[PDB]
Amino acid sequence: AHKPVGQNISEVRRNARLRRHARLRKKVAGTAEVPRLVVNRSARHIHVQLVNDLNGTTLAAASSIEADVRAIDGDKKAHSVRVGQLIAERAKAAGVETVVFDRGGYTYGGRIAALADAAREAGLKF
Amino acid sequence: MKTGIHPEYVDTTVQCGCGHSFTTRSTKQSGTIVVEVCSQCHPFYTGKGRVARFEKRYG
Amino acid sequence: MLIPRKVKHRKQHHPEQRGIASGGTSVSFGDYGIQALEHAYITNRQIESARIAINRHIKRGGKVWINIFPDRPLTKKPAETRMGSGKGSPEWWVANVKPGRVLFELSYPDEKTARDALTRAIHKLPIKARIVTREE
Amino acid sequence: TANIPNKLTANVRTRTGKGASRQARRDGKVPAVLYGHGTDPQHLELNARDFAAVLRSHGTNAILTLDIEGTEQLALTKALDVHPIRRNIQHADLLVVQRGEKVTVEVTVLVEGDATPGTLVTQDANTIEIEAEALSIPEQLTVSVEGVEAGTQITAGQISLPEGVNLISDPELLVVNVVEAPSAEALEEEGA
Amino acid sequence: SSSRNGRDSAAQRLGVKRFGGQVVKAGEILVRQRGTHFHPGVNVGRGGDDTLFALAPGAVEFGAKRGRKTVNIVPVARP
Amino acid sequence: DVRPKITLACEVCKHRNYITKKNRRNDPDRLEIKKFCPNCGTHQPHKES
RNA sequence: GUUACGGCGGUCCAUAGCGGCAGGGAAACGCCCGGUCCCAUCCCGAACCCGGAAGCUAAGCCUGCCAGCGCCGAUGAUACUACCCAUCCGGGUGGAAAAGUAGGACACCGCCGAACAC
RNA sequence: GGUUCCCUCAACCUGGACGGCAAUCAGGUGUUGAGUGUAAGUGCACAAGGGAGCUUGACUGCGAGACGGACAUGUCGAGCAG
RNA sequence: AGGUAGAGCUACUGGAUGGCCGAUGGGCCCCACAGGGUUACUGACGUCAGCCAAACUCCGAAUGCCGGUAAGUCCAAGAGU
Numbered sequence: 007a008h009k010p011v012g013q014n015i016s017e018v019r020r021n022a023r024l025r026r027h028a029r030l031r032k033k034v035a036g037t038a039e040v041p042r043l044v045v046n047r048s049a050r051h052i053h054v055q056l057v058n059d060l061n062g063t064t065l066a067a068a069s070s071i072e073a074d075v076r077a078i079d080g081d082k083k084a085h086s087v088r089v090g091q092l093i094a095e096r097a098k099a100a101g102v103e104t105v106v107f108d109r110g111g112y113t114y115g116g117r118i119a120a121l122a123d124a125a126r127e128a129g130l131k132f
Numbered sequence: 133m134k135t136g137i138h139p140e141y142v143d144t145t146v147q148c149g150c151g152h153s154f155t156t157r158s159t160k161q162s163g164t165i166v167v168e169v170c171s172q173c174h175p176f177y178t179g180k181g182r183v184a185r186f187e188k189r190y191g
Numbered sequence: 192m193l194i195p196r197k198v199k200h201r202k203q204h205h206p207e208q209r210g211i212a213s214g215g216t217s218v219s220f221g222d223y224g225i226q227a228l229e230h231a232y233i234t235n236r237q238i239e240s241a242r243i244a245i246n247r248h249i250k251r252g253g254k255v256w257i258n259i260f261p262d263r264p265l266t267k268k269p270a271e272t273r274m275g276s277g278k279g280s281p282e283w284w285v286a287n288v289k290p291g292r293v294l295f296e297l298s299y300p301d302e303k304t305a306r307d308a309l310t311r312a313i314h315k316l317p318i319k320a321r322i323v324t325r326e327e
Numbered sequence: 328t329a330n331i332p333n334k335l336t337a338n339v340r341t342r343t344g345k346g347a348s349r350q351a352r353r354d355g356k357v358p359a360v361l362y363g364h365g366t367d368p369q370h371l372e373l374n375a376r377d378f379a380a381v382l383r384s385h386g387t388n389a390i391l392t393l394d395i396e397g398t399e400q401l402a403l404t405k406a407l408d409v410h411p412i413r414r415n416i417q418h419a420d421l422l423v424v425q426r427g428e429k430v431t432v433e434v435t436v437l438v439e440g441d442a443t444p445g446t447l448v449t450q451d452a453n454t455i456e457i458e459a460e461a462l463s464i465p466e467q468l469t470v471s472v473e474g475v476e477a478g479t480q481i482t483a484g485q486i487s488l489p490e491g492v493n494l495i496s497d498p499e500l501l502v503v504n505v506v507e508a509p510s511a512e513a514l515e516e517e518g519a
Numbered sequence: 520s521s522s523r524n525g526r527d528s529a530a531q532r533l534g535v536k537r538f539g540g541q542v543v544k545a546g547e548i549l550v551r552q553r554g555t556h557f558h559p560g561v562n563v564g565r566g567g568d569d570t571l572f573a574l575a576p577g578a579v580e581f582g583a584k585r586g587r588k589t590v591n592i593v594p595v596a597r598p
Numbered sequence: 599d600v601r602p603k604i605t606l607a608c609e610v611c612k613h614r615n616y617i618t619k620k621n622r623r624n625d626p627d628r629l630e631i632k633k634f635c636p637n638c639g640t641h642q643p644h645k646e647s
Numbered sequence: 648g649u650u651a652c653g654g655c656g657g658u659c660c661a662u663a664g665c666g667g668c669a670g671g672g673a674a675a676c677g678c679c680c681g682g683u684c685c686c687a688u689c690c691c692g693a694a695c696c697c698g699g700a701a702g703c704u705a706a707g708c709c710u711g712c713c714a715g716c717g718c719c720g721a722u723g724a725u726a727c728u729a730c731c732c733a734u735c736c737g738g739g740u741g742g743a744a745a746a747g748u749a750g751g752a753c754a755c756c757g758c759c760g761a762a763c764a765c
Numbered sequence: 766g767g768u769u770c771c772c773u774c775a776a777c778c779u780g781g782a783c784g785g786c787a788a789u790c791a792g793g794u795g796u797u798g799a800g801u802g803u804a805a806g807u808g809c810a811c812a813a814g815g816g817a818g819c820u821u822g823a824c825u826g827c828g829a830g831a832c833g834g835a836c837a838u839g840u841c842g843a844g845c846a847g
Numbered sequence: 848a849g850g851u852a853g854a855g856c857u858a859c860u861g862g863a864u865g866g867c868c869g870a871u872g873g874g875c876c877c878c879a880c881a882g883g884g885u886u887a888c889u890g891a892c893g894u895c896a897g898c899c900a901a902a903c904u905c906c907g908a909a910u911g912c913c914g915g916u917a918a919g920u921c922c923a924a925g926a927g928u
């Protein structure tokens with residue numbers, strides 16, 4: 007019988023991110039007029055959503071799991087630009103033109119900053 | 133590793149009194165050191181001039 | 192004489208003398224006990240006089256429990272002074288007793304000497320009281 | 328161990344409250360409640376003198392068979408409300424039980440015998456918990472202090488229980504603590 | 520001798536000014552307090568000295584969110 | 599006085615726009631700080647008199 | 648539409664938690680490999696960041712069963728109380744606890760997305 | 766003081782040269798018992814508590830609507846422009 | 848919206864009764880040191896049972912207060928502003 011003594015770094019990392027995501031969400035919130043752009047990052051992919059916090063409903067969502075994004079022959083940040091452009095097309099196809107950015111806890115920079123600037127040049131303003 | 137805050141660090145080479153040699157990295161600017169006791173020399177690992185002064189003049 | 196080591200507040204209002212006792216209305220340790228039938232402030236001087244009276248009757252054997260403690264101070268202002276200028280310094284410690292409370296207990300091998308011993312203690316207290324046992 | 332249920336006549340109350348319960352007591356009655364796995368509590372009334380006679384000769388854990396408007400019902404006495412001063416019985420809880428059911432019950436332990444002449448007996452715990460059949464609850468539990476010398480902690484796990492009765496409380500309670508009898512100097516220093 | 524006591528300070532008239540269901544204007548004071556015994560809710564702000572005031576006209580409504588007592592302002596629908 | 603009252607003046611128009619306090623033991627020198635000068639209409643360096 | 652699946656939220660925010668036993672890797676979620684580049688350590692690529700895909704569900708995460716601990720908790724009775732009778736005792740109409748008992752309970756609800764099916 | 770970002774204490778158990786109950790180091794338990802310049806109270810772990818970078822809003826012209834009030838005083842405030 | 852009456856306390860801060868266990872101290876004997884048992888001894892920590900508080904609170908009324916609403920009195924309260 008094996009009995010681990012402490013906490014794996016995965017558990018420490020996970021609870022620390024949710025800790026600093028809630029500290030973020032004490033200010034930003036989603037409304038139908040000005041939705042919220044939630045981004046989730048992993049070691050393989052990146053996800054975005056447009057959430058309306060008034061009733062807890064998701065408007066549009068783009069992700070790196072889509073077949074067309076996988077075909078890109080760049081690095082991880084090259085797929086983040088592709089994912090950012092998809093959400094901007096889907097955001098404006100539902101009448102949304104202004105959003106607020108929810109970085110999800112992660113540091114703003116690198117992959118996250120690549121996605122946001124891809125969705126800024128594509129029409130969304132935030 | 134920050135740029136200009138750490139001691140200058142270069143690969144070295146240790147040579148013992150039993151003829152053993154290693155290939156390690158340390159902080160010594162010389163590039164090599166010589167030691168008379170190693171893992172192969174000290175009695176506690178192996179289990180095997182004052183001594184010579186009494187063993188030469190007196191026997 | 193029983194005296195608390197320290198009380199947080201030295202000069203306190205008078206303990207209220209309304210209602211009947213909520214807890215302590217039963218015998219837990221000994222075989223016999225003294226149950227109160229009136230409200231009063233039982234001073235530590237009366238408690239000491241009332242457990243010595245129990246001691247002098249059972250002599251050697253038996254055990255005595257005291258279920259109340261003089262926690263609450265009553266102040267007295269200095270003699271022959273006009274009213275006013277502060278509140279007096281505490282003098283004697285009392286225990287707020289309500290009807291139904293069990294004050295003393297006793298554990299002695301025979302009944303007549305134990306019931307007689309508790310009666311000597313009742314005559315030292317400023318209230319009506321009775322002797323109770325552990326049975327319903 | 329087998330018991331015979333005690334017959335009592337219970338009348339269903341019409342009005343409940345503090346005014347109605349006080350009036351019922353003045354007429355020589357005790358309000359009572361019959362809950363349990365019936366899961367629909369009945370607010371009953373019992374004759375004050377007849378109910379207390381059953382308690383006198385059978386103890387607090389008395390099995391009862393009640394007559395509610397012509398229908399019988401096995402009941403157990405769960406708890407009693409007693410005035411501290413008047414020693415009344417202001418209320419009573421009745422729990423519905425059926426034959427063969429196991430119920431956890433507190434029974435009294437009694438001390439008997441005559442120990443060493445130089446010792447004093449001090450019983451610490453008045454009751455211990457058991458778990459017996461509906462009709463197979465002992466009316467008392469007996470321990471013996473005979474020839475017991477000096478300091479001995481009689482323990483709850485050393486009490487001779489009948490068949491079909493299992494101790495529920497932990498087996499390390501201190502029930503009877505025989506001790507050397509205090510002297511005239513031990514009396515004086517204790518309590519000052 | 521004498522007494523060393525005898526001081527006190529002016530009562531500050533703290534407390535709930537507008538109660539549940541009571542229609543208020545914008546900027547109107549709802550609760551005066553020291554700490555956040557009551558936290559702000561929707562359309563309610565917290566002042567410099569922890570005063571809760573309405574940010575929009577409506578009706579007062581007390582709630583509870585994540586273990587915290589809150590004060591909320593709900594709109595009144597025009598006829 | 600340890601904490602005296604000091605007047606901060608614009609370094610362009612020499613107008614005395616603000617008054618505040620400082621500890622002349624922790625800050626033996628004249629306090630230098632930027633504040634809005636209404637006469638100039640923009641944030642300018644203000645230095646203690 | 649199906650799932651021992653992944654995000655984002657809610658409940659006058661534990662009936663949802665702690666603990667124990669047995670199980671899962673389809674895509675995802677993770678540990679994991681390395682420090683060329685954006686970036687970083689009051690020292691340290693541990694962390695934050697970046698580029699990947701040899702190993703594993705051992706941990707996080709998720710599923711099922713437990714009532715040992717915490718949690719919720721009546722009916723009835725009592726304490727207390729507004730008004731009213733009552734010459735010092737007390738009572739009537741209305742309201743009604745805290746503790747305890749029978750019990751409940753190893754959560755419930757909504758929007759998107761995956762793999763498969765249609 | 767302003768803002769942006771990061772963090773979780775006290776106590777207890779175990780192992781360590783001077784070193785001891787208690788200094789610095791390491792692992793575990795630990796949901797607030799520590800801390801908040803300063804009395805007490807109301808709050809604060811979502812931190813208002815600990816750490817770091819830049820900084821001067823410790824502004825100018827104003828201020829719908831309110832609290833409190835013998836009067837004179839006193840207090841809160843969204844929002845507009847520079 | 849409250850924290851009074853009541854009640855409750857391993858739910859906090861204090862006070863406090865009796866058992867059980869047993870570190871720490873006087874030690875005694877272990878020839879002086881570390882090396883083990885002993886108490887008419889002192890007894891932490893923990894635990895079982897019974898309690899107390901204007902400046903204690905995990906709880907918690909009846910009244911009173913603020914607002915809405917439907918009526919009542921209405922040739923009068925001889926009301927309110």
Ligand SMILES: [Zn+2]
Pocket residue numbers: 608609610611612613635637638642
């Ligand atoms: Zn100027």
